[PDB]
Amino acid sequence: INTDTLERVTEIFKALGDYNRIRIMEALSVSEASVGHISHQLNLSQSNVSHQLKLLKSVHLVKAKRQGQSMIYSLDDIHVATMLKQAIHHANHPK
Amino acid sequence: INTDTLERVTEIFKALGDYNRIRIMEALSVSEASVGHISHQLNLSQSNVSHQLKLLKSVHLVKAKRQGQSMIYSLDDIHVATMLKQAIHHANHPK
Ligand SMILES: [Cl-]
Ligand SMILES: [Cl-]
Ligand SMILES: [Cl-]
Ligand SMILES: [Cl-]
Ligand SMILES: [Zn+2]
Ligand SMILES: [Zn+2]
B27, B62 in Cβ contact below 8 A? Predict the structure, then answer.
């Protein structure tokens, strides 16, 4: 399949090969949330979390939507949710 | 969720952040196959393909099964298949 495609896939997985980015993604899989709420959940700086989310948004793994007086991040779409959830499933069984 | 877990997840995604490993995985998503058959499909050395498959087997993304006089590699299980297919889906639509 296409080279522009299999390159976008590698930048997606590349982006996911980082422990705190995975922690951010897995939190978002529970609930969309603001940068402040995420940094509180994970005990990371708002500066650090914001930087990571823009990296993730760069490869279309997260998106950001104004809601009221907050900027709310979410997993981009159902593909991202399913991909992450299957990965965690696989990491948690034997063989 | 657990640190042994979210570390196994990062090594999975880490392992997938490589163009030829993705090409190998995507070929296997079409059909299980021997090292020779893969290296022919992809025009890569058998030495290179074998090295990559042992890396992938290390993080339980592929498995290897004797069948007749051949050693056949496959995607480990349905979780891996779904994860890869969702990633490629996501890479191929807009927004
Ligand atoms: Cl939500
Ligand atoms: Cl922005
Ligand atoms: Cl098959
Ligand atoms: Cl072996
Ligand atoms: Zn599995
Ligand atoms: Zn998608």
Answer: no
- Give A33's DSSP letter: B
Could you tell me if A86 and B83 are in contact, meaning their C-beta atoms sit under 8 angstroms apart?
yes
Q: Which domain holds residue B6?
A: 1-95
Contact residues for B24 (Cβ-Cβ < 8 A; gap 6+):
B38, B42, B49, B52, B53, B56
Helix (H, G, I), strand (E, B) or coil at B45: coil
A81 token code pair: 């949710």
Q: Which two tokens stand for residue A73?
A: 């991040």
Contact B72, B32 (CB under 8 A): yes
Stated in angstroms to one decimal place, the resolution of this structure is 2.0
Cα A27 to middle of ligand 1, angstroms: 10
- Angle at alpha carbon of residue A14, lines to A13 and A19, rounded to 5°: 90
Q: Which of A35, A22, A24, A21 is CA-nearest to residue A72?
A: A35
Looking at the partner chain, which of A6, A60, A88 has a beta carbon nearest the beta carbon of B9? A88
Q: For residue A57, report the distance from its CA to the centre of ligand 5, in Å.
A: 27
Q: Which residues of B touch A91 (CB under 8 A)?
A: 5, 8-9, 12
Q: What is the CATH number of the domain that holds B94?
A: 1.10.10.10
Question: For chain B, what is the domain count?
Answer: 1
- Write the DSSP symbol of residue B65: E
